[PDB]
Amino acid sequence: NYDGTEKIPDVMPTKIPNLLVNGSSGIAVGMATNIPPHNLTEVINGCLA
DNA sequence: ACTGGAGAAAGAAAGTGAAAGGAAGATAAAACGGGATTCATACACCGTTAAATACCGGTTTAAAAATCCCGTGGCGCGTTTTAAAAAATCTGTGCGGGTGATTTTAT
Numbered sequence A: 001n002y003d004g005t006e007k008i009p010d011v012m013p014t015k016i017p018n019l020l021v022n023g024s025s026g027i028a029v030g031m032a033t034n035i036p037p038h039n040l041t042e043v044i045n046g047c048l049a
Numbered sequence B: 001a002c003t004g005g006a007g008a009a010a011g012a013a014a015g016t017g018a019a020a021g022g023a024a025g026a027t028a029a030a031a032c033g034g035g036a037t038t039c040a041t042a043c044a045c046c047g048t049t050a051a052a053t054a055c056c057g058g059t060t061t062a063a064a065a066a067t068c069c070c071g072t073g074g075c076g077c078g079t080t081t082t083a084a085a086a087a088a089t090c091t092g093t094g095c096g097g098g099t100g101a102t103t104t105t106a107t
Helices: A018-022 A040-048
Strands: A024-027 A032-035
Touching: A018 A040
Parallel strands: none
Antiparallel strands: A024 A032
């Protein structure tokens, strides 16, 4: 952490494709993102395919 | 007596709180105009007949149509203005993580 007295995970070991099913939206310097949500069953079927 | 700093007086310029009023808005009461019923009453449709009008044959004649000469103003051309519509260019705004700040009451 900032004081060097704790530990924080670098990334989560997720079982869910969260990015596609929930989307995202943010504004940065020189760029931006905009992603719509989706349906979980269709994403799972696509991953299996 | 003279000098230079400092404090106090006096005077002039700028900011101020309050000002009728008037065009510019805003809000209600009123007069209006457009639908649903309800019939009595005048209007639409059907047989009959005297009468008023359309039609044919032949004149005519006075009025309107046709023709010629001319002298103009009313359209036509070329070149400018001027609004009107269209294309181009600016102005706000909200989505989600970040930085920093404000106010009123009771005992």
